[PDB]
Ligand binder design. Sequence first.
Ligand code: JNS
Ligand code: JNS
Lengths: 149, 149
Amino acid sequence: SPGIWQLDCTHLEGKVILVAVHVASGYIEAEVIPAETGQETAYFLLKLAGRWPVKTVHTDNGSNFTSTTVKAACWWAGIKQEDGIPYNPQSQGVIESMNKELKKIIGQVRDQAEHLKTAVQMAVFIHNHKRKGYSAGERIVDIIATDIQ
Amino acid sequence: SPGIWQLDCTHLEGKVILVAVHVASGYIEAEVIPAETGQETAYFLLKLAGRWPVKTVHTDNGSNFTSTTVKAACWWAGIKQEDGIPYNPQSQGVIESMNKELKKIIGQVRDQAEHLKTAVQMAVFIHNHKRKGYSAGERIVDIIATDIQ
Ligand SMILES: O=C(O)c1c(/C=C\c2ccccc2)ccc2c1OCO2
Ligand SMILES: O=C(O)c1c(/C=C\c2ccccc2)ccc2c1OCO2
């Protein structure tokens, strides 16, 4: 559980927002890319795994699951690549809810930034600091620290 | 101490590598940029502060310290912006040593990646996982978790 992440791809302003969610905490990292390719997804995962102890990734679709470049990145970074099929159906709804939330926050900051990528990073900040009480940022650190110890 | 980071700018292949080091752990995040501008530094700090609880940043030079855009990002993200003058002289040498180390790792992976940015992220991964025994990634999580609790 401490090492499990889920990929999520959502769209805004004709652009693609790639999101990784740490399933147990709700903590996220995200980037704007022009389109969701294996190459972009691979690079994103490499970045993520250098920054957090990523053991398992549930990929967001079959193209990324199949991608040789994504498989290469997962091999390189020691990530178990899995499918992202919601065997538990409450999963789709949770992802859907998070995308709606992220887009709402993006709307709330959009005028403070010229570029979408900046608004997305503001949204990441607000999401990860939001008190729900602990924040998602607090939860991920606590979860991982408990695991290490 | 849990919230203190140091900026570091180093050069390779006619490009600029911007690094943030969590001083107490040695954990890093890094990006390749075409040149070190206030705009790029501001965006980098926004990303960092959305991902870790960044309280204080020791800026890497006077241009970034002065930059209105960097100041705006620090204000937005709740970061205390400080100078990076090594009042303790062992600091320059530690930064210097880390840049040499990062470049060495980059050299060791450079042929596995077409693009420098990929090699830099491989270097981030290797650096943060390296056991010294705890890794820098383990140290940062432990330090922050102890603070939160
Ligand atoms: O306007 C932008 O999108 C933008 C900005 C602007 C505001 C801003 C950005 C971060 C925090 C507070 C304010 C700055 C750097 C950037 C930007 O784009 C990439 O690097
Ligand atoms: O060749 C690259 O630099 C490159 C690569 C290649 C290898 C690679 C990258 C990550 C992990 C293992 C292998 C892949 C995606 C990318 C890349 O550039 C941006 O997105």
